[PDB]
Design a protein around this ligand. Structure first.
Ligand code: NA
Lengths: 81, 78
């Protein structure tokens, strides 16, 4: 009398280059870049919350202070713009 | 090279679909409509049982038992 259906959207893992700017880029910047890549790939523009190994990253923090090259962050889609 | 890997993740949803003979395609349509109601997006869905694709034209009792779980993968958005 019922079937359980798990609706799944596959993760999209993006490789985002961080340019060689003297002004270092922020976590917020990184979220924007990932959202734009998502839009380019899927036609949807997500709002994103970034975590490193389960820990929330502050948007204002600078990428090199919190991440090493080729580290992975998880970006949760919280809504669609 | 300074590269960051960003894994963008969308929340899966579990729907309970009552079956009041209905096809796999019907089941996909029910799930898609629920998704649309919940999230405002209408997905195109392929259904799998334990990783194996179910043919849309197959009848639910021929491929599934009561309370079996199927994975409905979003292949695109309408
Ligand atoms: Na997911």
């Amino acid at each position: 009398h019922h079937i359980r259906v798990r609706v799944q959207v596959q993760d999209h893992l993006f490789l985002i280059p961080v340019p060689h700017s003297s002004d270092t880029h922020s976590v917020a910047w990184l979220a924007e870049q990932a959202a734009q890549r998502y839009y380019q790939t899927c036609g949807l523009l997500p709002r994103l919350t970034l975590r490193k190994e389960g820990a929330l990253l502050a948007p204002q923090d600078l990428i090199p202070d919190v991440l090493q090259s080729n580290d992975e962050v998880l970006a949760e889609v919280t809504s669609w713009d």
